[PDB]
């Protein structure tokens, strides 16, 4: 059939000689596990070479990514299990994920929490020792 060398899914170009799992892995916000989950939900064999995808299959993948939970993805396998604002289960991809993480760090810095102070200073935030390691200069 029409074997596309390059396929664009969710606004990111995917390889044509790579399996669907690792091809979807190319999008920030999705890893091997979640890519396999998405393929299984869509009903596509995870091992098919990306490039044989049709327009309908690509649109189905797009819809699954848009609303993974409503399509059968478990509520505990999503990127944002409990949104701070809405209070729902969300999974963010690329730009929206970056904005969400930036907003979280900005909220910390705004409330003046210890983790926000450490974020702005650029030092470890999770309680590491900074005497012998973390030497950036």
């Amino acid at each position: 059939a029409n074997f596309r060398h390059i396929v664009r899914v969710a606004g990111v170009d995917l390889d044509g000689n790579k399996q669907l799992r690792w091809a979807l892995t190319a999008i920030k916000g999705i890893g091997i596990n979640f890519a396999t989950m998405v393929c299984r939900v869509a009903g596509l064999d995870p091992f098919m070479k990306a490039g044989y995808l049709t327009d309908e299959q690509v649109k189905k993948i797009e819809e699954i990514l848009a609303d993974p939970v409503a399509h059968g993805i478990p509520r505990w396998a999503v990127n944002r299990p409990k949104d701070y604002e809405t209070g729902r289960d969300l999974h963010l991809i690329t730009a929206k994920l970056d904005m969400a993480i930036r907003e979280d760090i900005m909220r910390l810095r705004r409330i003046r929490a210890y983790r926000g102070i450490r974020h702005e200073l650029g030092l470890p935030v999770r309680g590491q020792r900074t005497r012998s390691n973390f030497r950036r200069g």
Binding site: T86, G87, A113, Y114
Partner: protein
Amino acid sequence: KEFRYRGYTLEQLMNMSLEELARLFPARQRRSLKRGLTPEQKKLLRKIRLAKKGKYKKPIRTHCRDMIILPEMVGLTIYVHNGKEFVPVEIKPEMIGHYLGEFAPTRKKVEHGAPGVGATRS
């Protein structure tokens, strides 16, 4: 934009009881609330409730750095001990569910000077 926590406004959060607040809060805060509050934390809650009702006009100082902020504590200044002094913290809506000690830093930022004689093998 209007502040919202898990899709609930500030008035709804105030009206919600302790169990629902624990459900909303993360795992650590929910576990702390489930286990309960220590007597010192209970005294702190009594002081805050009196201050809110308007019969306590004096500043509120405490050593309880492990206390979690509740919605009813919003709109008050609490002086949290940091080992030496009682630094002031103004409770804001976005700070609910956080530990009261996170906003009272203990150590000081380091401005490293010239290394000493023994700082190197020379």
